[PDB]
């Protein structure tokens, strides 16, 4: 079990760690988060009490280094940093644990939610979407735009998701205009899967990462990306059976985790009604269709 210590908590803040969250008061004796499960990526995120504007946070994997959080009073945010001195770090964590100044990652043992939401998400792939190679962790916030949004403005600070555009030469073969537009299997299977993602695991990982950035930071371009990657599958007549079954599981857990009160801003009515009721795959997402109809029947 790994630990992300905090130097201190000088400003009042709501702290998120994956799907959990807790409040820290200004100057409260808070020194971090312990018992973080090894084997998964994780996200530690922040919303300041005095400016709920800009949710921000850091994707990291404790197997890749010793990471800590320290408030920067100049840039006005909690920053993730790497401690290279392993003995310094172990000494710091032990002191903070002995003084019981850390919250424990509150995983219920029955509970596979975080695994199910991050099954295909890899830190190496996150770092290609979020370019900042001098760090092993990746910063994301509510306002960051995607490479595609920037084509329709700072490139260093963008989300480099894979561009999906259904009315693009990449998506449409000359001479198959109607066929490729009404049945996107070519675009999904040859262009995206064989060509760009190489396999369905990488595709699902980007899909899962897009959803999580939409949910945790209200990142609009991430929500667009999540829906586009769903729609490309649902609009393809020819999809491997294992991908459909896995997609149904992925989406089920995303819909299950979504705050009920954010359904209005995180779910695109057109895409979901199309996907569940009109698309080629309208009968292939049994688990997702059942949870959507029982949880958000308004949207449909």
């Amino acid at each position: 079990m790994n630990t992300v210590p905090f130097t201190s908590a000088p400003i009042e803040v709501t702290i998120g760690i994956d799907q959990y969250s807790f409040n820290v008061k200004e100057n409260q004796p808070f020194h971090g988060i312990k018992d973080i499960p090894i084997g998964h990526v994780h996200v530690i995120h922040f919303q300041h009490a005095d400016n709920s504007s800009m949710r921000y946070g850091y994707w990291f994997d404790c197997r890749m280094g010793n990471f800590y959080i320290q408030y920067d009073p100049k840039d006005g945010l909690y920053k993730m940093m790497e401690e290279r001195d392993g003995a310094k770090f172990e000494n710091i964590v032990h002191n903070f644990k002995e003084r019981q100044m850390m919250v424990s990652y509150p995983k219920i043992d029955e509970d596979d939610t975080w695994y199910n939401l991050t099954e295909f998400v890899q830190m190496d792939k996150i770092r290609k979407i979020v370019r900042k190679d001098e760090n092993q962790f990746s910063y994301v916030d509510s306002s960051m735009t995607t490479v595609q949004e920037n084509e329709l403005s700072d490139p260093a600070h963008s989300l480099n998701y894979t561009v999906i555009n259904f009315k693009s030469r990449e998506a449409i073969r000359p001479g198959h205009e109607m066929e490729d537009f009404l049945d996107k299997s070519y675009y999904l299977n040859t262009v995206m899967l064989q060509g760009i993602f190489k396999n369905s695991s990488n595709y699902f990982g980007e899909l899962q990462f897009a959803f999580l950035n939409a949910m945790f930071f209200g990142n609009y371009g991430s929500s667009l990306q999540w829906h586009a990657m769903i729609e490309l599958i649902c609009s393809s007549a020819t999809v491997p059976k294992h991908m459909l079954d896995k997609l149904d599981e992925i989406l089920y857990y995303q819909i299950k985790t979504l705050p009920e009160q954010y359904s209005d801003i995180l779910l695109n009515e057109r895409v979901w009604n199309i996907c569940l009721y009109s698309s080629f795959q309208k009968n292939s997402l049994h688990n997702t269709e059942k949870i959507m109809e029982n949880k958000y029947p308004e949207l449909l």
Binding site: K167, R169, I172, E177, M178, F181
Partner: protein
């Protein structure tokens, strides 16, 4: 974006543009079968592609063979239309290619946009204008070339005859849509108006009769009357 009454004059500026109307591409007669079911029989159709500034009409005749063995023909017809308009643009010299294509029905937007991805600088636009181009097949010479075709064929016409020698494109489009709206509202009445006088003929190389300026004013008045009439017979006013 969309073309409407606010940006009317844009049609007669010097940026090449075409209207595309697909309402006569897929045409059928519905009939009873020997078993007493219903079936359709396709008949020849046409794409109506018109430059409103010059009157040039690119009439692409759609022969019934293009539907053989195909499913979902009303959907295919939109994509076939888009295929043929795209092929027309590619066949034109660069300096004759349109800057904008205005589709009369919004369902043509995605088919045509997809077929024109190679032409990112050509704007594909809808319109809120209530254009009556479906009545093109009430023009006897257009109907005749469509019905006689035994193979796919493109035929070129000037839908304004020689009107532009005497009137502006704005006025010529005004007259064309009044004629077509009348033919659409009461074809028999409209055609009687246009032909009731045998001394006024249609030249071999024209579509409409050789009316003098004064005769066109009379004709145009009669067409308004007809449209107002039928509007009365229709709603009882």
């Amino acid at each position: 974006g969309a073309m409407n009454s606010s940006n009317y004059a844009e049609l007669f500026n010097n940026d090449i543009k075409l209207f595309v109307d697909d309402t006569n591409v897929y045409r059928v007669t519905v009939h009873k079968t020997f078993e007493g079911n219903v079936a359709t029989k396709a008949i020849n159709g046409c794409i109506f592609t018109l430059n409103p500034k010059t009157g040039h009409l690119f009439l692409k005749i759609i022969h019934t063979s293009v539907w053989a063995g195909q499913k979902r023909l009303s959907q295919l017809a939109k994509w076939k239309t888009a295929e043929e308009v795209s092929a027309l643009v590619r066949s034109l010299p660069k300096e004759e290619q349109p800057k904008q294509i205005i589709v009369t029905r919004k369902a043509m937007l995605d088919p045509l946009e997809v077929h024109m991805l190679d032409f990112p600088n050509i704007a594909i636009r809808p319109t809120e204008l209530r254009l009556p181009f479906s009545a093109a097949m009430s023009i006897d010479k257009l109907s005749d070339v469509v019905m006689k075709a035994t193979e796919p064929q493109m035929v070129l016409f000037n839908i304004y005859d020689d009107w532009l020698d005497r009137i502006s494109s704005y006025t010529a489009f005004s007259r064309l849509t009044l004629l077509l709206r009348a033919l659409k509202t009461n074809e028999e009445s409209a055609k009687m108006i246009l032909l009731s006088d045998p001394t006024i003929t249609i030249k071999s190389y024209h579509l409409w009769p050789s009316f003098t300026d004064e005769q066109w004013i009379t004709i145009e008045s009669q067409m308004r009357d007809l449209i107002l009439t039928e509007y009365g017979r229709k709603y009882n006013v």
